[PDB]
Amino acid sequence: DNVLLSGQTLHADHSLQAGAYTLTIQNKCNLVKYQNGRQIWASNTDRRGSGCRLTLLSDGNLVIYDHNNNDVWGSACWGDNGKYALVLQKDGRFVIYGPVLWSLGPNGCRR
Amino acid sequence: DNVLLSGQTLHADHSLQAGAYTLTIQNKCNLVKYQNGRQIWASNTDRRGSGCRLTLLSDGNLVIYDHNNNDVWGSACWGDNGKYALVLQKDGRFVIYGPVLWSLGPNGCRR
Structure with missing residues (x-):
């Protein structure tokens, strides 16, 4: 899985993955980006909570x-x-x- | 792959795949969608040319x-x-x- 659509959730210890990269929302609340297992970036929120999840809101805001x-x-x-x-x-x-620019249907094109 | 980013191209006979769905740009220019290997949609442009490809432009326009x-x-x-x-x-x-709403970085948030 390399995509998280708005309204969807990535639960504790699950990740998005693309090529050599992985984005994992850890149970202990740190969102971490890895390159071949090497931590390259993190939200730096480890142990700030438990049973954490990651979700993309309807307005595009990404939240843990x-x-x-x-x-x-x-x-x-x-x-x-x-x-x-x-x-x-x-x-x-x-x-x-x-947001959505295009898809099939009548008024399917934004602006 | 299930994603085609701006500047990228899906070449002849190659396709995107997601779950039970496949989206193939055929060499003869027809963009065909399949559900479990069965055609359910097409751009209906078969034989409008050869060596066709599908690309997404920097302005979001999708073109064959x-x-x-x-x-x-x-x-x-x-x-x-x-x-x-x-x-x-x-x-x-x-x-x-x-377009892009957000990405990590100093100028990562759109507006």
Whole structure:
């Protein structure tokens, strides 16, 4: 899995993976990015909670919630409400794209 | 792969895959979608050319180009120049999300 769509959840100890990269939301709440197992970046929120999960909101904001729903860390960046996609890319970057520009259907093109 | 980023190209006979869905740009220019190996959708541009490829532009426009670089078919929908992502979703819908909302970095949040 290399994509997390808005509204979806990555639960404790699960990861996104692309090429040599992995993005894991750890049970103890640290969101960590690895390159061949080497920690290259982290939200630096280890042990700030337990049973943590990662979710992408309808406005594109990326947030880590602990089991009691406290907002542990977030990209703290939002756009208009709609549908977004977090992509862990083979180049190591995890980018949030959105909202929807196009898909099939009548008024399927934004603006 | 289930994602096609701006600047990337899916070449003739190659496809995106997600769950039970496959999206193939055929050499003869027809973009075909399959559900468990069975065609359920097509751009309906078969034989409009040869050596065709599918690419996503920096403005989010999705285009099928033949080997002579003629625009055979496209989403004919675009936004500001930036970065977009075409995602073939597990539910079978292929959606173009963009532009970038957020990424790690000093100027990572759109607006």
